[PDB]
Amino acid sequence: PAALKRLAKYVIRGFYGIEHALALDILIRNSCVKEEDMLELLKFDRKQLRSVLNNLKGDKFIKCRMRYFINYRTLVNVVKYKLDHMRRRIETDERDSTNRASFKCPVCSSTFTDLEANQLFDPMTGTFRCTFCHTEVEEDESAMPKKDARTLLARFNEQIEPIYALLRETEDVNLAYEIL
Amino acid sequence: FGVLAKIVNYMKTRHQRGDTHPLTLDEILDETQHLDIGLKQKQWLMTEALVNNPKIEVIDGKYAFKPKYNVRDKKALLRLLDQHDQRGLGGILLEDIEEALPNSQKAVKALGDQILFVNRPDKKKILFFNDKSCQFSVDEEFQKLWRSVTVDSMDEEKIEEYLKR
Ligand SMILES: [Zn+2]
């Protein structure tokens, strides 16, 4: 799984910082080692190193052997799940967040919907009117990224999709290696 | 012993100066201002400090190069790094600067080529290291990344199950 080593490296580089990554580079080698040997090689501080390993343990990137004496090894395949969860993450972003049909009162900066128009309208003025602060409501472009900002994030997402494509292709071949 | 340390320190400075030319004991006594240390101590030096010395370099019939013995190539560990199993070597910044030339001048060019600095020998202390493939997605990155620490929160073989269905 030489390609898997690059995909893992890629993913670590974009996500976690270099303090994690240097230890992570050794973990990428994947071998059963003792904390002391890993401490001698790295010369990191024991406390921060344990913070890193535990954060990784939280990721389930790591597995252990309890001899007490403790030894650490890489669980490898927390990768398929990691890819999948990220896609949902990327997708939720791709899911619409802009409440369409959607008026707001520029005075109270609160939000209301299309349905709330049928109750916030007043016939005496022939226009809409907020509840607790009687003022005309307009648009919605607040807190939720503007129409032109929407385009910028949707394109950014659209730009994100290809750059993780090869990784999926790596994953596709890895999953084929797991069919066998 | 103290006197011997002054020999070590002098020699250390001379190595640091860039030279490893050997000298006679007498000259070293003189340059360390320890000429009148006496026959006895000199003899102790000759029959322990200079011969029982685990890393003394004898060359040209004279004693040289005491501070160091582990590294002589004075260059990046290309051979050490090339290996896929024995790769490595986080090293002290002060060790690299002492070995030959100050790091900082090569580093300013190196900082976007072959060297990486991490704060680790205390936050003031610095370790030298290196890199390889790009980042994955342009983005604010730190904001998305901080919403992506997965869920190291259980029922996760079941969250992939749920996610597949
Ligand atoms: Zn209002």
UniProtKB/Swiss-Prot annotation, chain A:
Q: Please, which domain of life does this record's source organism belong to? A: Eukaryota
The disulfide bridges present are: none
Q: Where is the HTH TFE/IIEalpha-type domain?
A: 4-80
As stated in the Swiss-Prot or TrEMBL entry, residues carrying the post-translational modification N6-acetyllysine are 57
Name the positions where Zn(2+) binds: 105, 108, 130, 133
- Localization annotation: Nucleus
**Where are the C4-type-classified zinc fingers?**
105-133
Subunit details for this protein? Tetramer of two alpha and two beta chains. Interacts with TAF6/TAFII80. Interacts with ATF7IP. Interacts with SND1. Part of TBP-based Pol II pre-initiation complex (PIC), in which Pol II core assembles with general transcription factors and other specific initiation factors including GTF2E1, GTF2E2, GTF2F1, GTF2F2, TCEA1, ERCC2, ERCC3, GTF2H2, GTF2H3, GTF2H4, GTF2H5, GTF2A1, GTF2A2, GTF2B and TBP; this large multi-subunit PIC complex mediates DNA unwinding and targets Pol II core to the transcription start site where the first phosphodiester bond forms.
Q: Which family does it belong to?
A: Belongs to the TFIIE alpha subunit family.
Task: Briefly state the protein's biological role.
Answer: Recruits TFIIH to the initiation complex and stimulates the RNA polymerase II C-terminal domain kinase and DNA-dependent ATPase activities of TFIIH. Both TFIIH and TFIIE are required for promoter clearance by RNA polymerase.
Provide the protein name.
General transcription factor IIE subunit 1
Parent-protein residues present: 11 to 204 of 439
From Swiss-Prot, chain B:
User: What keywords would UniProt list here?
Assistant: Acetylation, Disease variant, DNA-binding, Nucleus, Phosphoprotein, Transcription, Transcription regulation
Q: Name where it's found.
A: Nucleus
DNA-binding region residues: the ranges are 1-72
Top-level lineage group: Eukaryota
An example Gene Ontology biological process: transcription by RNA polymerase II
Q: List the disulfide bonds.
A: none
Molecular function (GO) terms listed?
DNA binding; RNA binding; RNA polymerase II general transcription initiation factor activity
Q: Which GO terms describe its cellular component?
A: cytosol; nucleoplasm; transcription factor TFIID complex; transcription factor TFIIE complex
Which disorder is it connected to? Answer: Trichothiodystrophy 6, non-photosensitive: A form of trichothiodystrophy, a disease characterized by sulfur-deficient brittle hair and multisystem variable abnormalities. The spectrum of clinical features varies from mild disease with only hair involvement to severe disease with cutaneous, neurologic and profound developmental defects. Ichthyosis, intellectual and developmental disabilities, decreased fertility, abnormal characteristics at birth, ocular abnormalities, short stature, and infections are common manifestations.
The record's function comment reads:
Recruits TFIIH to the initiation complex and stimulates the RNA polymerase II C-terminal domain kinase and DNA-dependent ATPase activities of TFIIH. Both TFIIH and TFIIE are required for promoter clearance by RNA polymerase.
Concerning its family, UniProt says:
Belongs to the TFIIE beta subunit family.
* Assembly and oligomerization: Tetramer of two alpha and two beta chains. Interacts with FACT subunit SUPT16H. Interacts with ATF7IP. Interacts with SND1. Part of TBP-based Pol II pre-initiation complex (PIC), in which Pol II core assembles with general transcription factors and other specific initiation factors including GTF2E1, GTF2E2, GTF2F1, GTF2F2, TCEA1, ERCC2, ERCC3, GTF2H2, GTF2H3, GTF2H4, GTF2H5, GTF2A1, GTF2A2, GTF2B and TBP; this large multi-subunit PIC complex mediates DNA unwinding and targets Pol II core to the transcription start site where the first phosphodiester bond forms.
Q: From the Swiss-Prot or TrEMBL record, give the protein name.
A: Transcription initiation factor IIE subunit beta
The taxonomic lineage of its organism, from the top, reads: Eukaryota, Metazoa, Chordata, Craniata, Vertebrata
Of the intact sequence, the residues represented are: 75 to 239 of 291
